[PDB]
C-alpha cells in the first residue's frame, strides 16, 4: 500500500510520503489496471487489492469509479478516507487546496437527508465546496454540487 | 378549498382559476393563521384542514414550513402538489416561470440517492433549477441547490 515509486507515475494519487507514496485501495487498483508494467514491478494481483478494498470501505466500487472517470478525464484526485479530494487539471494535491470534495456513491445506496446534511456539513467544516459523485450500475459518473443558499 | 377571494389577499398562493383560488392545505393552513378575518369569511378551522392535508400529502407540515419560511421571508410561491414553485419577490406566480422548484423534506424522512435523482430530473423535466428545503424540529427551514455539473 505504500509505493517506493515516483509520484507522478502513479497519477499523483494517495499520500506523496517523500520516500513513499501512501495509497488507497481503489486508487491503486486503478493504477494496476492503467500501469501494467507497474503491476509487476510491484507483483501485487487486483485480485487481492479489490479484496481489501471492500472490505475496508462500504463504497470501494464507488470510489474506484470515481477515481478512474476523474483521472481519465485529466483531473488530479486524492483519496482523502471518505472523501475524494478533486483538483484542476494540472495542479498537484496538497500544492493548493482542492476545489471541491467529492462523495462517492450509488444510486441504489440508501441515504437520510439527514445523512446528506451531515456529509455537507463535514466539507463545509473543511472549508471546501461539495460534490456528490453518483456512479451507475455501468460505472459511469454523473457529478451534482450540493451547496446551502 | 376553493376560495371566492381575491389573490392577493391570500398571499398569490395556490392557482387563480379566476372566480377563485384553488389552494392547498399547507398553503390554505397559512393563510389562517395569518389572516384571523379570513379565518371566519371562511368559517374553517385549521384542525379539520390539518387533519386533511396529512391524509393527502405525506409531507404536509414540510410544505407548510417551507411555505411559510419562503412567504414570510417575502417570496412569493406556489405549491404545485409537488414541488413549491418559488418566485422572486414582487413576482405574481405564472406571470413569468418561478426560479425554483423546491422540495420540501424533513432531516429524518428516508431517500435513496437514487429518489434525490428522480425528484432534480423532474425539475430538470421541467426546464428550471432545483432547491431542497430541509425542515428541521423546530420548524426552521433551510436551503441547498442541487445542480448537476
Known amino acids: 500500500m505504500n509505493l517506493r515509486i515516483p509520484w507522478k507515475e502513479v497519477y499523483y494519487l494517495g499520500y506523496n510520503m517523500g520516500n513513499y507514496i501512501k495509497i488507497s485501495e481503489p486508487e491503486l487498483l486503478f493504477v494496476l489496471r492503467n500501469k501494467p508494467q507497474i503491476k509487476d514491478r510491484l507483483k501485487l494481483d487486483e485480485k487481492t487489492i479489490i479484496k481489501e478494498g471492500v472490505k475496508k470501505y462500504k463504497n470501494f466500487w464507488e470510489i474506484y469509479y470515481t477515481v478512474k472517470d476523474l483521472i481519465l ?36 445506496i440508501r441515504m437520510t437527508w439527514g445523512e446528506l446534511l451531515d456529509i455537507y456539513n ?8 461539495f460534490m456528490l459523485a453518483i456512479v451507475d450500475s455501468e460505472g459511469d459518473v454523473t457529478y451534482y454540487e450540493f451547496r446551502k443558499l
Chains 1, 2 share one sequence.
Open 122 to 129: 463535514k466539507a463545509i467544516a473543511r472549508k471546501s465546496k
Open 73 to 108: 478525464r485529466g483531473y488530479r484526485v486524492r483519496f482523502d478516507g471518505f472523501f475524494i479530494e478533486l483538483y484542476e487539471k494540472g495542479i498537484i494535491p496538497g500544492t493548493i487546496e482542492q476545489d471541491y470534495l467529492v462523495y462517492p456513491v450509488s444510486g441504489e
